[PDB]
């Protein structure tokens, strides 16, 4: 019959800050750390795996049934009621053991290590068992471009670009689950939207487009050492296609110029 509520809360910290551990009976607000939404966990029931030989259990969830799955909400939380008792491989009732496995980290963050515990666990005053897995922020990189009229030097809205890598593959943004998303004008905040960068054929690539300040680009690049190329695909009427622009994700902004098309007598 009986279950305990396990409340998992996922907080992000500055890269050089390492949270102190919290007991399961303590409610911790995160002290200003940012809650991480959209992070997927699978909870495995490893009762049988552990009780086959407790002193040898090193975290295997091979063949373990899935007790639950979830995704952190806006508060960084997922809550799951778990049976405090479960059966081992021979059918005998035992204290249940559950292993928490992060299957999909937030963009810009490392995954957290697998952890496990026995129930019932020490609970807070409200009866819930609180866990706070650590996800360390990894440094990522961004790039901004400003489209301008080569003659007037004024910013130019509505210019379309695709991005290519050294293999001739082009950038496609997806959501956390790998599905298509609708990208508009401007700088795309990959980190804030929890998007992914993928590399595909030119025809399926994402088009980035200069906004009303001429701006386009994105964050969430893995490194600042690889060369990519911005290639004009949509040219505003009355301009000549900008030349390809080689770049690195180096957190800079730089201008891409469009020459007004010349009309001769």
Author numbering: 38 to 302
Publication passage describing the model:
This was remedied by modifying the purification buffer. Crystals of full-length E269A-substituted GG-SpaA had formed after three months for the E1 and E2 protein samples (for details), each having the same space groups and similar unit-cell edges as determined for the WT form. Moreover, the overall topological similarity of the E269A crystal structure to that of WT GG-SpaA, and including the molecular arrangement in the asymmetric unit, is high (RMSD of 0.4 Å). Surprisingly, electron density for an intact isopeptide bond is found between Lys184 and Asp295, despite the absence of the glutamate residue at position 269. Intriguingly, the alanine substitution of the C-terminal E-box glutamate (E269A) that presumably catalyzes K-D isopeptide bond formation had shown two contrasting structural effects. Up till now, this latter bonding behavior had never been observed, as in all known pilin structures, either a glutamate or an aspartate found in the vicinity of an isopeptide bond is directly associated with the bond-making process. Surprisingly, the mutation of E269 in the C-domain had no influence on K-N or K-D isopeptide formation.
As the first reported host of “non-pathogenic-derived” pili, Lactobacillus rhamnosus GG is a gut-adapted commensal lactic acid bacterium (LAB) and one of many clinically investigated probiotic strains for human use in the prevention and treatment of certain gastric ailments. As with other Gram-positive bacteria, sortase-dependent piliation in L. rhamnosus GG (called SpaCBA) is assembled from the ~30 kDa SpaA (backbone), ~20 kDa SpaB (basal), and ~90 kDa SpaC (tip-located) pilins.
